[PDB]
Design an enzyme around this catalytic site. Sequence first.
Site, PDB file in Angstrom:
ATOM      1  N   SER A 205       3.781   2.790   8.603  1.00  0.00           N
ATOM      2  CA  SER A 205       3.364   2.143   7.145  1.00  0.00           C
ATOM      3  C   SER A 205       4.610   1.363   7.136  1.00  0.00           C
ATOM      4  CB  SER A 205       1.971   2.421   6.504  1.00  0.00           C
ATOM      5  OG  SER A 205       0.859   2.424   7.334  1.00  0.00           O
ATOM      6  N   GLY A 206       4.501  -0.232   6.664  1.00  0.00           N
ATOM      7  CA  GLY A 206       5.565  -0.669   5.964  1.00  0.00           C
ATOM      8  C   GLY A 206       6.764  -1.176   6.125  1.00  0.00           C
TER       9      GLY A 206
ATOM     10  N   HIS B  99       0.779  -0.770   0.268  1.00  0.00           N
ATOM     11  CA  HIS B  99       0.038   0.263  -0.292  1.00  0.00           C
ATOM     12  C   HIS B  99       1.002   0.886  -0.142  1.00  0.00           C
ATOM     13  CE1 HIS B  99      -0.001   0.164   4.277  1.00  0.00           C
ATOM     14  NE2 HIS B  99      -0.122   1.642   4.090  1.00  0.00           N
TER      15      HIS B  99
ATOM     16  N   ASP C  62      -0.275  -7.655   1.502  1.00  0.00           N
ATOM     17  CA  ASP C  62      -0.257  -5.947   1.585  1.00  0.00           C
ATOM     18  C   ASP C  62       1.840  -6.183   1.976  1.00  0.00           C
ATOM     19  OD1 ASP C  62       0.568  -3.692   1.749  1.00  0.00           O
ATOM     20  OD2 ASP C  62      -0.323  -3.144   3.430  1.00  0.00           O
TER      21      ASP C  62
HETATM   22  O1  LIG Z   1      -7.972   3.718   9.307  1.00  0.00           O
HETATM   23  C1  LIG Z   1      -6.981   3.624   8.862  1.00  0.00           C
HETATM   24  C2  LIG Z   1      -5.363   3.586   8.791  1.00  0.00           C
HETATM   25  O2  LIG Z   1      -4.706   2.464   8.764  1.00  0.00           O
HETATM   26  C3  LIG Z   1      -5.251   3.969   9.812  1.00  0.00           C
HETATM   27  S1  LIG Z   1      -3.704   5.014   9.790  1.00  0.00           S
HETATM   28  O3  LIG Z   1      -2.968   5.574   8.522  1.00  0.00           O
HETATM   29  O4  LIG Z   1      -3.246   5.778  10.866  1.00  0.00           O
HETATM   30  C4  LIG Z   1      -2.959   3.982  10.230  1.00  0.00           C
HETATM   31  C5  LIG Z   1      -1.690   2.489   8.856  1.00  0.00           C
HETATM   32  C6  LIG Z   1      -0.843   1.957   9.536  1.00  0.00           C
HETATM   33  C7  LIG Z   1      -1.307   0.978  11.093  1.00  0.00           C
HETATM   34  C8  LIG Z   1      -0.629   0.098  11.142  1.00  0.00           C
HETATM   35  C9  LIG Z   1      -0.659  -0.644  12.890  1.00  0.00           C
HETATM   36 CL1  LIG Z   1      -0.150  -1.793  12.479  1.00  0.00          CL
HETATM   37  C10 LIG Z   1      -1.254   0.522  13.294  1.00  0.00           C
HETATM   38  C11 LIG Z   1      -2.023   1.558  13.202  1.00  0.00           C
HETATM   39  C12 LIG Z   1      -2.178   1.922  11.858  1.00  0.00           C
HETATM   40  C13 LIG Z   1      -2.960   2.519  11.536  1.00  0.00           C
HETATM   41  N1  LIG Z   1      -7.451   3.219   6.959  1.00  0.00           N
HETATM   42  C14 LIG Z   1      -9.208   2.663   6.833  1.00  0.00           C
HETATM   43  C15 LIG Z   1      -9.428   1.123   7.038  1.00  0.00           C
HETATM   44  C16 LIG Z   1      -8.364   0.691   5.347  1.00  0.00           C
HETATM   45  N2  LIG Z   1      -9.044  -0.474   5.204  1.00  0.00           N
HETATM   46  C17 LIG Z   1      -8.283  -1.518   5.035  1.00  0.00           C
HETATM   47  C18 LIG Z   1      -9.377  -3.078   5.712  1.00  0.00           C
HETATM   48  C19 LIG Z   1      -9.770  -3.462   4.285  1.00  0.00           C
HETATM   49  N3  LIG Z   1     -10.294  -1.952   3.181  1.00  0.00           N
HETATM   50  C20 LIG Z   1      -9.703  -0.638   3.872  1.00  0.00           C
HETATM   51  O5  LIG Z   1      -9.999   0.396   3.735  1.00  0.00           O
HETATM   52  C21 LIG Z   1      -7.095   0.957   5.993  1.00  0.00           C
HETATM   53  C22 LIG Z   1      -7.234   3.021   5.988  1.00  0.00           C
END
Ligand SMILES: O=C([C@H](O)CS(=O)(=O)c1ccc2cc(Cl)ccc2c1)N1CCC(N2CCCNC2=O)CC1
Lengths: 50, 232
Positions: free
Chosen positions: B185-186, B42, B88
């Site tokens: 992320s990543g 992603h 991912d």
């Molecule tokens: O809220 C977010 C973001 O993930 C929130 S963030 O960017 O603050 C973020 C990123 C990575 C993280 C990794 C860890 Cl280990 C813990 C916390 C994290 C927080 N979303 C809505 C849900 C979507 N999603 C997933 C499931 C499949 N379809 C989706 O739309 C992903 C995106």
Amino acid sequence: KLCSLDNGDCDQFCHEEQNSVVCSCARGYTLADNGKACIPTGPYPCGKQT
Amino acid sequence: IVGGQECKDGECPWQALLINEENEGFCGGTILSEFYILTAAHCLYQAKRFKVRVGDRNTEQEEGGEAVHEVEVVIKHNRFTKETYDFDIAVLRLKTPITFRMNVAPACLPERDWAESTLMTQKTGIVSGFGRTHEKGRQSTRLKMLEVPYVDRNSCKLSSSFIITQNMFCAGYDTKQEDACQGDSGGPHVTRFKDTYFVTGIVSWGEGCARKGKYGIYTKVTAFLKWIDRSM
Ligand SMILES: O=C([C@H](O)CS(=O)(=O)c1ccc2cc(Cl)ccc2c1)N1CCC(N2CCCNC2=O)CC1
Ligand SMILES: [Ca+2]
Ligand SMILES: [Ca+2]
Ligand SMILES: [Ca+2]
């Protein structure tokens, strides 16, 4: 059952083959004489802090 | 990283930072070798073009130990979709090799069935990054790390209306305000076994950051060890 307790005394990977423990190591490590410990083969081995 | 603490010198040497065309960090990665970085698929959709910084501990200061590498090729998993966030995972091949040195060293790849049985069954792992320091928060200028408990599979699946697949795992806390966040992320999730760190996860997604009854979702590296080996 052999790797279920104390990782078969292996430093890294443990497997069971023909009813005996076989240890192994990640790339950049070699098995010590004792067949359990993993010795780095060069500088900056993987998974070690610097 | 929400909560946790700053990485000390030597402590998180496999951390990589992906930097976009405006030189801003936007994702992490894990150093696997002199030529290869592990990251999330992603992350590839956050910036058209990007580079990889290693040895960075402080994003607002020049250190004299940090280096920027350009990417030769991106190897993205074919089955990743934005709809599911399943699969991912991506690997980056760098144009020029990394010279391992202080704060720059590879994490170990685990071995699949041993890691499923002995590594993933440990109480905790460690996640690290330069991401947001709370939900809606600023990114951290300093590299942070955080110990996160592995979460049992049923608590994991029940925590979300999104499908959490066999290629994912949960780590973190029910209510304690500590988690990874956007920008981590990543990056690396590592698990220690007898004084050696193995990369076990890729920071993938969460519903916000550090929310009550929500966990961090990580790509399960053991599910991709042959894929990683083939890519490398
Ligand atoms: O809220 C977010 C973001 O993930 C929130 S963030 O960017 O603050 C973020 C990123 C990575 C993280 C990794 C860890 Cl280990 C813990 C916390 C994290 C927080 N979303 C809505 C849900 C979507 N999603 C997933 C499931 C499949 N379809 C989706 O739309 C992903 C995106
Ligand atoms: Ca810096
Ligand atoms: Ca095996
Ligand atoms: Ca939570």
